[PDB]
Amino acid sequence: LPDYVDWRSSGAVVDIKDQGQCGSCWAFSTIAAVEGINKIATGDLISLSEQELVDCGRTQNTRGCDGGFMTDGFQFIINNGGINTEANYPYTAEEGQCNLDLQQEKYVSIDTYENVPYNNEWALQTAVAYQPVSVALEAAGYNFQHYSSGIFTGPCGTAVDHAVTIVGYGTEGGIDYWIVKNSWGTTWGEEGYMRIQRNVGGVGQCGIAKKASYPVKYYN
């Protein structure tokens, strides 16, 4: 695998977004991964609608601003035959009624999704070498919350509670890291991103390797 990967460098990552006062992170992670594979497979970068997932993608386990799962996000886009753009179905940071007309407008599609084998940073690295990958991690701790620069090495728990998107990886000063795209706006971390320690084993740093998944498009 490559020594360094950064999906931002090849125009596969939309500018940093802010979920605001709403636990919709599963939706931001779903969308960032779909945005990535769409650029990789088709050549065009399009900013897509988190609000559509929040309003229209509710399940037994996925509950808009009350948390959810990227697998349900991917499932919705597959089931619906696509997803609308950010511009057409804008983000409100509030749970609203599913706009059926906007739901019918489809600008990006995915064919399938896959789960990265659990607790396997090597499998995760393999997946990230091909595309941005949706992950969940433990983001509730003071140090994670106040992260501003460098490679985050903890402390943090492992009990997944917040979804982000891995958009690359690398090594600096002998320390391996993942590049994480968060949805807390540009004022958090390294202009919205975090470098977080990689190759620590097991569940990965802050549990990052526990529940990784990515969307699939059959044709390039």
Q: What is the CATH number of the domain that holds 200?
A: 3.90.70.10
Backbone angles phi, psi at 190, to 5 degrees: -90, 80
Q: Is the peptide bond before 90 cis (omega within 30 degrees of 0)?
A: no
Contact yes or no for 166/135 (Cβ under 8 A): yes
Residue in 56, 84, 156, 182 annotated catalytic: 182
Residue in 22, 56, 162, 206 annotated catalytic: 162
Separation of alpha carbons 207 and 138, rounded Å: 6
Q: How many CA atoms lie within 13 A of 47 on its CB side?
A: 11
Round the CA-based radius of gyration of the chain to a whole number and report it.
Answer: 16
Helix 70-80 × helix 25-42 angle, to 10°? 50
**Structural domain tally of the chain?**
1
Question: What's the first-to-final CA gap in the chain, in angstroms?
Answer: 20
Three-state SS for 92?
coil
Task: List the alpha helices (DSSP H) in the chain.
Answer: 25-42, 50-56, 70-80, 100-103, 121-128, 142-145
Three-state SS for 190?
strand
Return the bridge partners of 181, or none.
Answer: 165, 193
Read off the tokens for 58. 């509710």
Residue in 25, 56, 156, 206 annotated catalytic: 25
* 25 is a catalytic site residue: yes
Resolution of the coordinates, Å: 1.5
- The experimental method, as deposited, was X-ray
**37: nearest Cα among 215, 218, 219:** 215
118-142 burial, b at 16+ Cβ within 10 Å, e below that, comes to eebbeebbebbeebbbbbbbbbeee
* 206 is a catalytic site residue: no
Return the bridge partners of 180, or none.
Answer: 166, 194
Backbone angles phi, psi at 66, to 5 degrees: -100, 30
* Residue-number span of the structural domain to which 77 is assigned: 1-220
**24: nearest Cα among 94, 108, 96, 83:** 94
* 162 is a catalytic site residue: yes
Separation of alpha carbons 144 and 154, rounded Å: 7
